[PDB]
Design a protein around this ligand. Structure first.
Ligand code: 1E4
Ligand code: 1E4
Ligand code: 1E4
Ligand code: 1E4
Lengths: 327, 325, 328, 331
């Protein structure tokens, strides 16, 4: 008799099915930062990794597995073949091509043309969380290819940039980012919209204390805080070659709202046709209620007409780009 | 329109189907300790509480709900009606009768509770904590109709944690690093498996062959004695115990909810193993995961340790033979 | 020869000094709720409990200790003598006195603090004091006056829980988690507390701007009643289970987290606010306070209406009047 | 009036002093893995990073800082100047030189010693009372080096040693047995790497000796070849390096576990490298992994594992070998 059989008597003959499974697609720096952040938050009972770089993929799986003693996620699997991803509650897309342009978008679209059908094949009921850049466009692409209802296709959107904003705000005010509130909405990147009217500590409107807030006439140049947010990815890439930890943490926080059905409000990109004056099939970041069914509700933020037009402009540019894509 | 609708545009017709729901039956000091321990370990997306004292029940629910901001368990519900427990993955029974013929009244209690539980959560695991726990776990099992892997008694889980704590005080290292197993029938008849006690793989019995005997100058036998009495001592001091039992139950909930397949000293239907031939529940090292107990470790026992477990089997069966459901 | 010495080679002598010790005074339901919450959030490397009911005390300690395997707080101690509390970073006061009369009730709590607070200060000169005992604003004043600590190191839990309740109820009406609902209750703890309607918001969207009637008696939705619900909820729960424990426990653990981790988060807690919010007297009220390893280091100056400002002035007069009549 | 003063009234002049500060030296993949693991277990109220590559250092600091919203460590600081590490409770050394073509392994070690000769005095100067946790390889030798350079008492100089390899061993044990690593117990002791000692006698689940169930356990005559599990442990770093070019996540998790025992004074028992002269029959000043009680004063106690004659022979041999290399180093 084998030692295992001498030691342990099997009483139950049982099967598989994971109950809180999460898949990360793409094991680059971003994918793996999402992975370790999720593992250390105890968000999943099974974690699947997939990539096309099979050695890298296997090496990352093994490195995570060796840390089992220290985690509470009993199963970590990987493979080039998407069957490893079966029955995921949530699938996180961090795959992309790397730096032309617009031809860069099409190559990412071609990457998605392969990934997304495979994901939906083995997890017809998952939530899709897209992190790949450009995220608003790629999230729309995942949505179109997947055939999912819009509530289940989510883009990381402005979630990290709002967190950065709050950190910088916290630096200026001498309080933790947790206590500093402010929203960056709309199109992820240089065109994102800092909603000066919403910024506050303990319910106290900064814009009201300080009417020049966010304008060129602002002696304190709060406008530059937003630009610092917009530039920070660029600045960090410049220093270390990429970013990982913050985006990883931010993605894990979204996963928490989903897997625990918290219905917290996050600034993430959702298909918002019919809201905010927008008439195109596009994804923009607005405050969304996030739960076990993905995005079920959207907060309607009161915007200035300047903010509204800026949001409509992003929709039209996003749509303009989406028309040139081949599916 | 209502302020909610001015503030919030609804995009989805929301079905609330709980995914990782846990129920605690009985909101006494034990149930509520299990509750707060589970809430603070983030093991459920929904907690249900059930009891027959409706005022107490509603008040406890409300008190937990009020701490929502500090928790990550978005839904907490309660009621005397078991519809509130629907679709639980795990249901924890702390219900018990007010003070033999007690077990009979506890059995009567279980005759009402269990079918109500099974009706609303057909697929749940059952974790019995009520005393006498090995007997009531057998009752829960029989009444429930469930296969044996899905019915679990807290058994010697806590007493083992107590033993390791006391081991750690004597040796000067954390209980986590002191290993020792109390098995068999919960209570005074439980078995201190001297041979398995160790730190870092070093057998204490081999270092100290007198370990656990009368001739032991260090009197380690009194450590098991102290574990078996400790509950009585705490009740004497504060009227009941709560925190330790609550923490130990949350630990089991954790292995279940996260499918960890850790080994715990808990009470399982072990007919067929350890020389036992009756439908009884005794604590052995069990692999605990999303399907309950799926495997048990076969501990190498001395001939008298063996005879002691068999005696408890016949003891329990003897008591079970009287009960009626 | 001894087994321990056979198993274990000792290399280092004991210099055992606590690095992040918390004491909870009072092991009633509130006290133990704070203790269990603190233990399960790993805020302390040593916990001490003190009370005068010595059986109950020892019993609570042992029960906690039996849970060690499942905790990461290696040392739990207790005693009637305050030497067990020495070198606490944080000492939490939940002790209280058990239809006549109010002022006479307060005085007997003062009497308890006259015994407790000096004992705490003697053994933990550098600690922060966090008072939870009712009425908390007054009793936080008494702890401050008695202890002789600077005001930054004496904190009352104040309206911290009530704000948390307010956000929970806000969340139930709006269909989102309380974490994402923001509202502030300030001022005197209890039914004199002030709901600051102008700061209530989700995602920076002002509810009052959306709904100008918010919190007036001219509100078809009666949001004013949410504050009342908050105010009443404590006594409703008391009506139902005899007391409250779990939420106040978690509330206090949250404050302990900001202090022990120096988070400088903002909480609505009771601070000596003479010289702010138009308050002239030595009075403790709840305002949004920056909370960290040195206690309360900063206060957020909320913009209040003249009515709201008047409410706080009134409470300051009430509290000051009562304190005027206390025997220290 | 500045918006901040308009919004916030300052009641206290702050002289900030960190209470549970951890420093990580070296922001390579290993350093940042320790760093993220520590941050997500809330073990420090301040984290400091140091390295010689200033851009890389600043980038990593900023990336972590941008995650502040999701963390409960209010202060992350970095700099090439060791003033940023002042008053750390724990300083974790992951700095190393990488081989060339080229140079012998001794010349690679000496270049690491050269690195430590610059780092260790800087660390000791700003945090005289810290514990040192050395992770850099070869770990037993470089932990010896930090001990000697720092002048710290031995209880305060700790090498990660066989901690991770024992974790790997329990994981692989759990895969064969169908049980979580948490419930599989087994110890890799002695010199980190090839010459480490799998202590078969101590392997168990639930206190059931595997060796007693299966006396061939760990022998060549073992038909189940459990020795191959030790070889797996020994080769796992190389195997992972072949696939992804380095390891990070596991060693990072294992380091934070040690950090946890130290910062919380847990007095858990870990397989880590300590100065064991005078114990285990060792006559030399060397560091070997044995089961150590780890707390706020570092390693206060070691467990005395009963070893077979051939196990004792391996350790004493490793001692000679380490001491031999040590005598060849320039301090
Ligand atoms: C290249 O092909 C593939 C690559 C894959 O690997 C993806 C991954 O490894 C790489 O994206 C890489 O590691 C980058 O680092 C990650 O870049 C990201 C990803 C991300 F989600 C977010 C950010 C980000 C966001 C915000 C900020 C900030 O705000 O700070 C910073 N960073 C950066 C996978 Cl899994 C499949 C395919 N493809 C296949 O499945 C085959 S089909 C196909 C079709 C076409 C092509 C082709 O044309 O190339 C290739 N394959
Ligand atoms: C009484 O009726 C009922 C009471 C109920 O209340 C339950 C609860 O509140 C009480 O158990 C109370 O909190 C006890 O104190 C808790 O005692 C326990 C419970 C437990 F699980 C473990 C321990 C324990 C273990 C180890 C240690 C240690 O080792 O340290 C210490 N402690 C102690 C419920 Cl939910 C339903 C019914 N019944 C109904 O559903 C109606 S049907 C019915 C039938 C018959 C009878 C009757 O005959 O009376 C009554 N009802
Ligand atoms: C009786 O004396 C003492 C009693 C002591 O026991 C304390 C404790 O066990 C009891 O407070 C018990 O647990 C209460 O129930 C808890 O009630 C509380 C306590 C609290 F902090 C907050 C809340 C609260 C807050 C908000 C909400 C909500 O908003 O929901 C709900 N609840 C409720 C101690 Cl440690 C020392 C002395 N005293 C001594 O040290 C001797 S000196 C002395 C002097 C005078 C007197 C005398 O006048 O009698 C007595 N002793
Ligand atoms: C180059 O010099 C320096 C390098 C430094 O490097 C920091 C960092 O970036 C690098 O360690 C890099 O990331 C490595 O790759 C990481 O490699 C490691 C490190 C480690 F701790 C453990 C493991 C490990 C363990 C187990 C397993 C497994 O079991 O799985 C896998 N991996 C792998 C620093 Cl902060 C200062 C100096 N130097 C100075 O301070 C100036 S003094 C000086 C003296 C001499 C020399 C010279 O000779 O060159 C240079 N400087």
């Amino acid at each position: 008799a084998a030692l295992k059989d001498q030691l342990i008597h099997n009483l139950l003959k049982e099967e598989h099915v994971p109950q809180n499974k999460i898949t990360v697609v793409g094991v680059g720096a971003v994918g793996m930062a999402c992975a370790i952040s999720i593992l250390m938050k105890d968000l999943a009972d099974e974690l699947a990794l997939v990539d096309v770089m099979e050695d890298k993929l296997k090496g990352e799986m093994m490195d995570l597995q060796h840390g089992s003693l220290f985690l509470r996620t009993p199963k970590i699997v990987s493979g080039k073949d998407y069957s490893v991803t079966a029955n995921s509650k949530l699938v996180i897309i961090t795959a992309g091509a790397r730096q032309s342009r617009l031809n860069l978008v099409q190559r990412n679209v071609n990457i998605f043309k392969f990934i997304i059908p495979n994901v939906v094949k083995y997890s017809p009921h998952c939530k899709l969380l897209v992190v790949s850049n450009p995220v608003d466009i790629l999230t729309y692409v995942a949505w179109k290819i997947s055939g999912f209802p819009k509530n289940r296709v989510i883009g990381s959107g402005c979630n990290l940039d709002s967190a950065r904003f709050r950190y910088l705000m916290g630096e200026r005010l001498g309080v933790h980012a947790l206590s500093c509130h402010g929203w960056i909405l709309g199109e992820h990147g240089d065109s994102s919209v800092p909603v000066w009217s919403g910024m506050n500590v303990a319910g106290v409107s900064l814009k009201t204390l300080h009417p020049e807030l966010g304008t060129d006439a602002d002696k304190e140049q709060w406008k530059q805080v937003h630009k610092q947010v917009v530039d920070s990815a660029y600045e960090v890439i410049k220093l270390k070659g990429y970013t990982t930890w913050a985006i990883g943490l931010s993605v894990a926080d979204l996963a928490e709202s989903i897997m625990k059905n918290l219905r917290r409000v996050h600034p993430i990109s959702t298909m918002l046709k019919g809201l905010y004056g927008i008439k195109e099939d596009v994804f923009l970041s607005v405050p969304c209620v996030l739960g076990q069914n993905g995005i079920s509700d959207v907060v309607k933020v009161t915007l200035t007409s300047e903010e509204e037009a800026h949001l409509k402009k992003s929709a039209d540019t996003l749509w303009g780009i989406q028309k040139e894509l081949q599916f």
